[PDB]
Amino acid sequence: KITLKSSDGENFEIDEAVALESQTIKHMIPLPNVTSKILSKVIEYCKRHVEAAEGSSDEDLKTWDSEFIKVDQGTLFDLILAANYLNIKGLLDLTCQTVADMIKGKTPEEIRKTFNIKNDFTPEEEEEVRRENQWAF
Amino acid sequence: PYLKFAHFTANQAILEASMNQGLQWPALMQALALREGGPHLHEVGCKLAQLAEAIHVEGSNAFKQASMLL
Amino acid sequence: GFSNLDENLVYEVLKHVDAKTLAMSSCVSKIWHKTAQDERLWELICTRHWTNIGCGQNQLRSVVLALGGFRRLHSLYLWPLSKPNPRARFGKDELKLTLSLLSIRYYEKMS
């Protein structure tokens, strides 16, 4: 039984064993960076993983993970930030797999367009990077 | 296509057990290096010594590697 | 905020792609390019489809990084070899061929 407060100031409570899934929290709680929504998402993830810890159940957990993964771009970015901050392997890995599936896409115009990435390659550098990876094209 | 064929076949024959341009011998260096238990002529010898210092050095398989070569 | 990701997040994302996707993303931008030239990602990609080699990862990584790196190991010789047998897994002779090719190339380009 531990109490976690977020930027919203809500003293979200969770069990000690469930909160132990975060290495940063276990080592050391204002938590000025993690937002209330993202903190609630990590709390739900930790609760579900603790329930699973205490196959058919394995694939049910994977399906629940896939359902929870369905969030927009900003939510996924914030989830990655929070997972990196709080030292959670599973959540960071799941978000990384989702982003990898997203970037498994088309020619570089697609990747630069979906992520609003603004490339500024010099013409020499752009052409050279195209030639040095010609095997893929 | 015969030079590389002879180089690789002789290299495999030696590993399982002339100095023109010293081109066959660099390929064997990785063979002795990544081994279980551990490992005009003057200029070629100097380059070979530099290569040896760089990487910390003081049959069906032969049929296969030739086959992938061509 | 994917447009302004740091190197660590880009590396973490790129840890779960294949050779085509990595060499593809290497042309997205400059920071993505720099993260894609990482040796660890290409070592993972090269060793993914080997699954039978063994001599110690330290020795292999040191020698391959000394003789050009794992990026040259892939595009020059590994990709042409895997082109007509995509499903086949590279065993022992493929490594003995590709590393010899890298040694010959390094000695030729030394001068």
Domains of chain B, residue spans = 2-69
Nearest to B68 among C63, C81, C107 (CB): C81
Query: Cβ contacts of residue C31 below 8 Å, gap of 6+?
Result: C5, C7, C10
| Radius of gyration of chain B from its Cα atoms, rounded to whole angstroms | 13
Element (H, E) at A124: helix A123-132
The helix/strand count (H/E) of chain A reads as 8, 2
C79 chain-A contacts, CB cut-off 8 A: 135
CA distance A81 to chain C (A): 9
C56 in Cβ contact with C70 (< 8 Å):
no
Pairing state between β A2-5 and A11-14: antiparallel
CA distances from A1 to A4, A16, A20, A26, A87 (A): 10, 5, 11, 13, 20
Largest distance between two CA atoms of chain B: 37
DSSP annotation of A23? H
CA distance A114 to A110: 6
Resolution of the determined structure in angstroms stands at 3.1
CA distance A101 to A123: 29
Q: Hey, what amino acid is at A69?
A: I
Tally the C-alpha atoms within 13 A of residue B55's C-alpha that lie toward its C-beta: 31
CA distance B17 to chain C (A): 15
Nearest to C45 by CA among C18, C24, C73: C18
Residue A39, Cβ density class (10 Å: 0-12 exposed, 13-18 middle, ≥19 buried):
buried
Nearest to A130 by CA among A116, A114, A113, A109: A109
CA distance A38 to A19: 15
CA distances from A73 to A69, A83, A84, C1, C105 (A): 11, 15, 17, 8, 45
Kindly report the length of chain B.
Answer: 70
Could C97 and B8 be called an inter-chain contact, meaning their C-beta atoms sit closer than 8 Å? Answer: yes
CA distance C63 to C69: 8
Experimental determination approach used: cryo-EM
CA distance C81 to chain A (A): 13
Domain of residue A63, CATH code: 3.30.710.10
C15 chain-A contacts, CB cut-off 8 A: 96, 100
> Is residue A89 less than 8 Å (CB to CB) from chain C?
no
> Is residue C4 less than 8 Å (CB to CB) from chain A?
no
Nearest to B65 among C63, C66, C96 (CB): C96
B34 chain-C contacts, CB cut-off 8 A: 55, 59-60, 63, 99
Measured between its terminal Cα atoms, the distance across chain C in Å is 46
3-class DSSP assignment, residue A71: coil
Nearest to B30 among C93, C94, C103 (CB): C103
DSSP annotation of C63? H
- List the 15-74 stretch of C: residues with Cβ below 8 A of A: 15-17, 19-21, 23-30, 32-33
Kindly report the length of chain C.
Answer: 111
Which residues, in sequence order, are bridge partners of residue A4? A12
Domain membership flag for residue A12: no
Structure tokens at C57: 């990862």
A51 in Cβ contact with A78 (< 8 Å):
no
3-class DSSP assignment, residue A106: coil
Domain membership flag for residue A17: no
Structure tokens at C41: 């990602």
Domain that holds residue A65: 37-104
Domain membership flag for residue A67: yes
Q: Please state, as a whole number, how many other Cβ atoms lie within 10 Å of the Cβ of residue C105.
A: 17
Nearest to B66 by CA among C14, C24, C96, A61: C96
Nearest to C101 by CA among B30, B48, B22: B30
Report the domain count for chain A: 1
The helix/strand count (H/E) of chain B reads as 4, 0
- Give the DSSP letter string of C70-102: HHHHIIIIIHHHHTT-SSSPP-SHHHHHHHHHH
CA distance C109 to chain B (A): 11
Query: Cβ contacts of residue C79 below 8 Å, gap of 6+?
Result: A135, C19
DSSP annotation of C2? G
CA distance B44 to B24: 12
Could B8 and C107 be called an inter-chain contact, meaning their C-beta atoms sit closer than 8 Å? Answer: no
Structure tokens at A29: 């709680």
